[model samples]
Target chain A: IRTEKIICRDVARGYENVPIPCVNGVDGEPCPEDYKYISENCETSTMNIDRNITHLQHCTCVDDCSSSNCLCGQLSIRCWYDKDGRLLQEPPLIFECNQACSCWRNCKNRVVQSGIKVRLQLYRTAKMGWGVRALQTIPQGTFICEYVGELISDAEADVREDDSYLFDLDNKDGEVYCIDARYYGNISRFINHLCDPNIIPVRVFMLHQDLRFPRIAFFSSRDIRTGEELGFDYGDRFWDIKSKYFTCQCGSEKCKHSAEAIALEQSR
Target chain B: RTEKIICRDVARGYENVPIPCVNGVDGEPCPEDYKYISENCETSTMNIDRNITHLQHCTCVDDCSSSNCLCGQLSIRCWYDKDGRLLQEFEPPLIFECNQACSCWRNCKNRVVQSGIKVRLQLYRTAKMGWGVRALQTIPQGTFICEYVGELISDAEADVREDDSYLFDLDNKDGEVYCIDARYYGNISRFINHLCDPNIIPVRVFMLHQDLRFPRIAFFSSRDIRTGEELGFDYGDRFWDIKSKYFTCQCGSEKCKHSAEAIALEQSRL
Candidate 1:
């Protein structure tokens, strides 16, 4: 038997419906909270790969904080926006205005710092349990929100039975840190996976460039219309995890199926 | 052309992981994209259709200064506290809410209830009712809780339903009043029961435009409630008919209609 079409869950048209946190009760996650706030402006990020990997990728521009002159500026040169505010794909590494910089709060390169400008909500999925959707059309390359959780060690990550909510920092430096949001998380914890997604999980190093744990940030890969559910590839190894018990209902032919273990052959 | 995400946990649930859905319950599924309750709902019944009234949409400059804005046109307004408690003891024929399409900020005055429940609640088992819901913490007066979700059906079908427990009749003005039957598909609100005295009250809310036939049901704290207190509303007229079929309600409240009825029979008055 096929389930009815999953459509916008509003009684009246155009209203935002909040998702019921499956286990977190009414006080889901914690408080003043979005996933990015948990990072505290990157002052106290996890020290898995580089505790003292202190590299400030700064731009010292007098006109605006963003420029193609300095180390941070040159890298940012690769990042461009359309007249429509769409970020060119692989928009440059987040060229955050340094706390010590002259740029005003309204500088050009500091887009991610503006935080989420659109309304979003957590919605319950028939088989996926919970997911996030947009309330308005978001232009491509807009900063959606951040995935937040406590910075934990690999040893700590080993203790949790289900790692669905824990996101790896994806540090190339062999740093072993993970953000575990099973306990304290924001709406980002509710975003489910999709074989084909509209958003991109870009690893951004904002303030502290330890490089091991670049802040995990999200941006619209293309123009996203309202009511679209946000999704992402956990990596090619997604099936390597989750389906240990839960089923992946993404239904995308692009879906690897359950977990990394059984979906490889079926994928080809 | 756009090859997006992978399934199976969408690469392990990133906080704000920017990914969109495929084969997903896609974009504003409302037939005309009128404001809707959830993103798009999944009902057990597909092709189940309805006769819905059309509503209008507006654009505002700032806080809707123009008398043309929906709220500006509200002849008699019902004021609510920050907690959303009605300031006065009265309500107009209808309530209008701003939609996302409006050119207003998140803090626009007429835009209450556009964003859904922000408080914490619990759906637990009740001694009398098979399952019940409550606030996990103290809730302020006027706070908006969850929407009473369910199957959106036409009035004709709503009248035929033998049971009315899960049916919330959309207070309609015209020919048909839609019914949201939470029986098979709904959120925690489906589990809320009637109370002789309740801390919450159902308010009729309309969004974006005005359609006398289609205002949704929004619940608000009638008064401040303590933590763990059960949230209930006097099921009002919808349940007034079926109420007598069951035993006298055990809700211990000063103004309990059931209790008043029981007292009426004390002297063998019946």
Candidate 2:
């Protein structure tokens, strides 16, 4: 195969958001045109970053945070990540130290805010157009990456042309907002959906405490080895609507939309 | 020279940030050089008397939800409900909102117009029209959108303004014709397109001014507006009558007064 584009050079779009360069090992095709690379969530032109809402409380930790001493850690019972910066457990919520916190940037309590750690590569898949895979071993619960895109109101997302990469915010009300990664995104957008996913999405909150909008952090569900493709479950409602004319090529043993499953349904 | 994406906001560091223009719609162009101001700035050449002290104040403690508040009772009917949302039950010609002089706190229920642009809005380039504004979120029927912020000038000054596009006649009636000229200094209200059947309507709101002739022109949603819906107000017959020969109404509404079909139908009826 001919050498192609190494998508992100220095990983950071503006600041030190990404440390390692992410390469695309696919055929000599330039990165998608009209798509802009962004490091963090950016509010769409139509939307405003609401500052009226209450801000997230900062932790009073003096030194590098430890599980027992960190106040930010106490927000979710304990420090979420291990010393190696891997998530300790998948919880309903993960509160990281905000920039307002007195704690150092190297505080063990902070992981997702620190940006992507593991080396990753994007390659053209057999069935999926573009998919992401690991270049190095990732321990279970390691923070893979964050879903970054244009933050649009759920209402705007409703009228948008594409729903392929739209991730709705975790909210009490029905999808008050969504992250539209169709036009602006990072490596997280390339990861395709799998019936049996090896990655799990966890809600992470940093500065803003608005429950309507939360940052989505993806972590390895199991130990991810080098060259292993990373995928996540986009959920059943997604396939329920799409499966009418679409096909799923997850290749999992218990694939819900496998050839046999479709054949059986057609025969019935 | 190639067009490069220099800045996202046409306002350029002024007003709210994060106005989006995709790739280099740079060739498409941004708004012309205009100083963006949040509030109306008066010209130093002449001073229009603005006295707010004499206006009635409400001494409601904590909140102004009760009917007892004097400021809330200024309108013919109650303007806002408990949540500060404008009630569509009564479409009052004038809105008398509570001023800073009121004893009630800043988040008082009666202070809807002064709250400013609470709902998210986008200033976008329109295909036919130069530029337009749209709702970034679902706006309720009675939500306060924004005020037509600009420089307050006398009628003679307005006569010399030449451009009628950005001028709002503050004094729509007889004495002392005052106009809000947003050509030089204004807010996002300057870009809102004019529609025959508009979702928003400008209502006279009085806050700092007890003056009847110069009540601040504030736009409120006439009906529930969905996301991505372009916002507009009826630009009135006077605006159309003046520019009817040169400008064709491209609002695309079925009831567009200036459209060829509508004009032909009216001529046929005559």
Candidate 3:
């Protein structure tokens, strides 16, 4: 019987070596397609291995390749095996496909260009009582969204935080957001805060030379069954944070209220 | 420094002796106080050698005492020692205890006891999903759980040979290659089930014992899994498509309906 060989090779996608400086050019010259340069103000700075040459070895799968075959597909890195069959020291970072493509048949049809299902839209929560809803049964570890949006000054979010206790946002530079297109300009912002949120935002560190800011991805912390209200902890930390006064009408037993006064009855 | 015996003559508390039945059985009805020889049937019995008494009898040992011990409890019988002294046997049964009011004990198919040696961190299956031993107390992230136990095979011979006899076959070109014999391997490897979206990801690290070091590492959860979830690793990612097919997916995650072959398909992008 002929047994199938397990081949360990670099993905079929060729590398897209973009010059980091070209993306960071002034307003007259915009960044190239699928490239986002980090703003000069950002603390971290990029340097080429050689100053005379600008291109860094950033690889992207060709258009003919499926989304799943792209480097950043499904949060997996393409591991390169050497001629000696040993894994290479540093595996190159691959970018997710900007649009959909068809390569392999069967399951490849389901491979969409987007790395995630739901994208998080950055917005302040209003105090009227609203929360995001799961469109589909999101399995754990599934990429929910890349925490994308403009990096606002921490002072701006803190200013929004002053008037309403519900507007508390993570002020840290690496903080991730989980709001999406549907809830972007909606009343879902009114969903009051919870110390222990049903949704959790994860901080993913991506090395993209094009982006003006470091990208942080967020995913559902748990299996979000369809129609479940998605809420995130706006508290300072994942651990113990401040508890507000209102009792949570969400009715989860583990619920810590938005107001501590209504939570007094449940405390006993 | 002299090695002192911790449990001095603790066998006095152990009333049961080997009865005249097969393997570890002596001809006597088990007393109420001690564990009995409940069954004579060895359904998966591999071999019978009166000369061979413990698990380590066949292997060569550089150190007598250290080479034959397992889990800090089970006594491995080894014959290649200089003095030919059979060490004290101390194998214990796998047990389970529930800290919460859950029905996991009743649902588990594996045999379990109320109390025995509590594994500091155990990898076991839960009804909902894969479960891991997170710290009720402080536990360091990368700690060795147990050595991967199975029949050993050399790298050169493993390619041509086909049998469910070996645990790991050394074959990688880094000269650091060992394929886990998925078939007939012990319960530890069996405890690792399949998951479409796995919670515990296996980190491959080499552990070195001075005399007989097996290049294996423990699997840790990728994230915090709750108390009552099943424990799983990406078994499909390691082996080729052919070897991967032998294993089945049992993780009850909504995305787990796919076969093991799907891992290759899922990973084709990477």
Per residue, candidate 2 scores C-alpha lDDT tens digits across A113-188 of: 7777788776676677778888899989999999988778867888999888899775765448889888777678
Runs of candidate 1 exceeding 4 Å displacement: A1-268, B1-60, B64-69, B81-85, B89-93, B259-270
Model 2: how far is A190 from its true place, Å?
Answer: 62
Which portions of model 3 show Cα errors greater than 4 Å? A1-57, A60-128, A145-150, A161-198, A204-212, A236-249, A257-268, B1-270
**For every model shown, what is its TM-score relative to the native structure?**
0.42, 0.47, 0.25
Q: Between which residue pairs do clashes occur in model 2?
A: none
TM-score between model 1 and native: 0.42
Docking tier of model 1: it is incorrect
DockQ of each model vs. true complex: 0.01, 0.01, 0.00
Indicate whether candidate 1 or candidate 3 has the larger DockQ: 1
Candidate 2 per-residue lDDT over residues B133-187, each given as its tens digit: 8887999888888889888788788887777789998764757778889987787
Which candidate leads the pack in DockQ?
Answer: 1
Top-scoring candidate (TM-score): 2
Q: What's model 3's interface RMSD, roughly to a tenth of an angstrom? A: 33.3
Please state the error at residue B39 of candidate 1 in Å.
6.4
- Assess the local accuracy of residue A145 in candidate 2 as a C-alpha lDDT between 0 and 100: 91
